[PDB]
Design a protein around this ligand. Structure first.
Ligand SMILES: Cc1ccc(NC(=O)c2cccc(F)c2)cc1O
Length: 185
């Protein structure tokens, strides 16, 4: 792909983070803590899952960023509406305002309803995410495999401003402690 020139500098929004997440000083890395991180509760924080939003809001244009997922067993990545539900149980689906892929139990899937199997021969260490607001497109790329396409959501109905979306996953296994990192341009 040739989307690299739409690169945007994404930072994480502490106020949206689940209370167990640890966001780095530069707001470019996040990992699951082993305990509550001593923050107050608020209506923005994801309560049920280890999720956080980027600070940036997009309502037009073309945007590209990359995320490092090295040595994680489980994660969700993509974009979501600014107005997604924060509290309680929900599924990641376009009907609920999410355009995401994930890793879980050694398989990769797109967050359609129901979920779609992905075909990845080279497990990615970094994921590229491209959003074309006007076209209604969200695409995912395997940076480890020379930028190969993973999945395209098309005919997207964003229905509001979009925010970068992240889930570091639980760490019940002791094998999923590694961070998500926003990679440099
Ligand atoms: C299911 C659910 C609903 C609501 C809340 N949190 C609050 O309403 C809240 C707002 C301001 C200060 C505060 F401490 C809490 C957490 C939840 O998990």
């Amino acid at each position: 792909h040739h989307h690299h020139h739409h690169m945007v500098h994404i930072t994480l929004d502490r106020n949206t983070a689940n209370s167990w997440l640890i966001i780095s000083k530069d707001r470019r890395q996040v990992r699951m803590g082993d305990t509550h991180q001593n923050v107050s509760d608020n209506k923005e924080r994801f309560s049920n899952y280890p999720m956080v939003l980027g600070a940036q809001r997009f309502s037009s244009g073309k945007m590209y960023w990359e995320v490092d997922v090295t040595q994680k067993e489980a994660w969700d990545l993509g974009v979501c509406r600014d107005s997604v539900q924060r509290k309680g149980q929900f599924s990641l689906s376009p009907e609920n305002g999410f355009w995401t892929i994930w890793l879980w139990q050694d398989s990769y899937e797109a967050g359609t309803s129901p979920q779609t199997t992905l075909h990845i021969q080279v497990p990615p260490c970094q994921i590229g995410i491209f959003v074309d607001y006007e076209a209604g497109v969200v695409s995912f790329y395997n940076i480890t495999d020379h930028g190969s396409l993973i999945y395209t959501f098309s005919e997207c109905v964003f229905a509001g401003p979009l925010r970068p979306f992240f889930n570091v996953g639980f760490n019940y296994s002791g094998g999923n402690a590694a961070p998500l990192k926003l990679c440099p341009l």
